[PDB]
């Protein structure tokens, strides 16, 4: 099955077209579209940017620069679930390091790494705006206070 130019699956293309039609100008939809792409594939595939750029009526170079600039987007590692761990001042003070330890015990990985099954990636992030509930992490869109290893293990068991 020889390779041919990348094309968006119909169900994804539909969603992208929806974002593009949502704002007055197509190019305003770029971040929504990139979120949608990363949601679908578990990362931003490099080959996806050219056809996205065509849909936005933007030069490819513009799209690439945007992907590079915004820290939430990941062109390198596919992962089903991103565990975003806050490493900023309040979480650090209140126990980021205990959360990271518990994550290593449960998943066998450190920040920046992906489990061997492609399931989880630990992503260190700046303040998540939940500092009263420090230390904070997210699992894709879900956000939690870390309490303990037993508690974290129960939380992660819900992601399959």
């Amino acid at each position: 099955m020889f390779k041919t130019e990348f094309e968006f699956p119909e169900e994804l293309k539909t969603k992208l077209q929806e974002h593009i039609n949502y704002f007055p100008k197509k190019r305003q939809a770029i971040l929504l579209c990139l979120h949608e792409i990363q949601n679908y594939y578990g990362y931003i595939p490099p080959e996806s940017l050219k056809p996205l750029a065509d849909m936005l009526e933007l030069p490819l170079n513009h799209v690439e620069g945007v992907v590079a600039f915004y820290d939430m987007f990941d062109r390198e590692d596919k992962a089903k679930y991103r565990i975003r761990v806050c490493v900023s001042i309040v979480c650090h003070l209140m126990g980021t390091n205990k959360l990271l330890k518990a994550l290593e015990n449960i998943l066998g990985i450190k920040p920046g790494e992906v489990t061997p099954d492609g399931k989880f990636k630990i992503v260190p992030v700046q303040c998540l705006g939940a500092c009263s509930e420090a230390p904070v992490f997210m699992v894709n869109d879900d956000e939690y206070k870390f309490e303990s290893e037993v508690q974290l293990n129960e939380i992660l068991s819900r992601y399959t």
Partner: protein
């Protein structure tokens, strides 16, 4: 069904912005309407736009996004320029320690929406945006749903309640950049570009989104507008001290017993925020410092200041991060340096290189690997991030850390 959100504690002595948001759940339009919601909008649409501006001016309302700029005055500046005009709600909230705006978004979205509609009407904007940080996905879904609710009840769309006023609100998402909370970088992002601040002047109120007059206001600011209309400016100005009137939200975190968001008048002191409202310190340890987000460091000798926008007041966004006696100030300073390292957009050379070097060297200092030259270099870089900077980030990236050098010399000297 929305993504899981931590249930941030919220408490109010005024029962305004947190009247509903003190309860940690989504309040949908029916509950909002039962509390008299959208009646302020109806009243506003029977007033002239100029009248509304006058009321917001006379209320003394100031922005809650950090700069404390008088809101009515900002509006007056926008409307002296020809239309069309745009209104933007800044929901980028990404400064360390700051989680005040999200509880309005997530729990009382109609308060924000009502404020957006009134504000848009006041400045003649028929298109409004909410720009919400990418790491608030629940807030995004909650706002999208609430907007649809408002549309169904006829508070949004064409010819709102027979007024002839048209409005659509579009919800945009960020994708991980603190700098996109700076009003001009926010606008660049809304235009589909990287979040690079623009040289000011011009200011957004003159040339903003697509080069047109644009008002950017913070979530908290906008949430005040329904109260000003409902109560009238005079009754609103009766709340708190007459020069800094009305409610303010204070996100309190770190080493307190009751971390969370407090709605209080601005004559409240910092000492009262910590000890009267937030329950005092964990383990009853002595306060060592308060970080005002990533902006300022107050010592234990500076707790008797008002939480207002006066020169000797706390100011900012009212973000209170409490460190106690056992907390290492240099370790804390490193975290602040790391934040600016990660968030400079890199357009300006001293900011780009200074934010990086400040964190790089401070890490060496903290780990006991700094040479004498690294120490001298750190001092120099910390004082030289600001030159040529075109936005506030470069101006303040060294500020808090410099204050720790001045206020806690004995801890720093331990590392040297």
């Amino acid at each position: 069904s929305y993504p899981a959100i931590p249930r941030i504690y919220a408490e109010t002595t005024l029962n305004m912005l947190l009247k509903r948001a003190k309860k940690p759940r989504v309040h949908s339009i029916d509950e909002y309407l039962k509390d008299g919601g959208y009646q302020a909008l109806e009243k506003a649409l029977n007033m002239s736009p100029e009248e509304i501006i006058d009321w917001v001016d006379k209320s003394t309302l100031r922005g809650g996004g950090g700069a404390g700029f008088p809101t009515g005055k900002k509006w007056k500046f926008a409307v002296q320029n020809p239309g069309p005009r745009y209104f933007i709600c800044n929901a980028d909230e990404s400064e360390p320690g700051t989680f005040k705006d999200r509880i309005i978004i997530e729990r009382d979205p109609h308060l924000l929406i009502e404020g957006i509609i009134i504000s848009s009407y006041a400045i003649g904007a028929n298109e409004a945006y909410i720009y919400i940080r990418g790491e608030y996905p629940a807030g995004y879904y909650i706002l999208r749903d609430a907007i649809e609710e408002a549309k169904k009840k006829g508070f949004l769309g064409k010819n709102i309640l027979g007024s002839g006023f048209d409005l659509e609100i579009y919800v945009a998402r960020g994708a991980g950049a603190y700098i996109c909370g700076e009003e001009t970088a926010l606008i660049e992002s809304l235009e589909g570009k990287r979040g690079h601040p623009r040289l000011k002047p011009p200011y957004p109120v003159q040339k903003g989104l697509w080069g047109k007059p644009t008002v950017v206001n913070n979530v908290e600011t906008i949430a005040n507008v329904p109260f000003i209309i409902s109560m009238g400016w005079e009754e609103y100005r009766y709340i708190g001290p007459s020069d800094y009137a009305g409610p303010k939200l204070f996100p309190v975190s770190g080493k307190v017993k009751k971390p969370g968001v407090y709605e209080l008048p601005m004559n409240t002191t910092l000492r009262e925020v910590i000890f009267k409202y937030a329950g005092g310190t964990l383990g009853n340890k002595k306060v060592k410092a308060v970080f005002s987000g990533a902006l300022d460091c107050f010592s234990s000798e500076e707790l008797d200041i008002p939480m207002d926008y006066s020169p000797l007041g706390f100011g900012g966004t009212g973000t209170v991060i409490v460190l106690t006696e056992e907390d290492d100030i240099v370790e804390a300073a490193l975290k602040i340096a790391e934040f600016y390292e990660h968030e400079t957009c890199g357009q300006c050379t001293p900011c780009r290189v200074g934010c990086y070097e400040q964190a790089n060297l401070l890490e060496k200092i903290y780990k006991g690997e700094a040479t004498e030259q690294d120490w001298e270099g750190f001092d120099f870089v910390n004082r030289n991030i600001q030159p040529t900077s075109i936005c506030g980030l470069g101006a303040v990236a060294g500020r808090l850390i410099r204050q720790t050098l001045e206020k806690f010399p004995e801890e720093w000297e331990k590392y040297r």
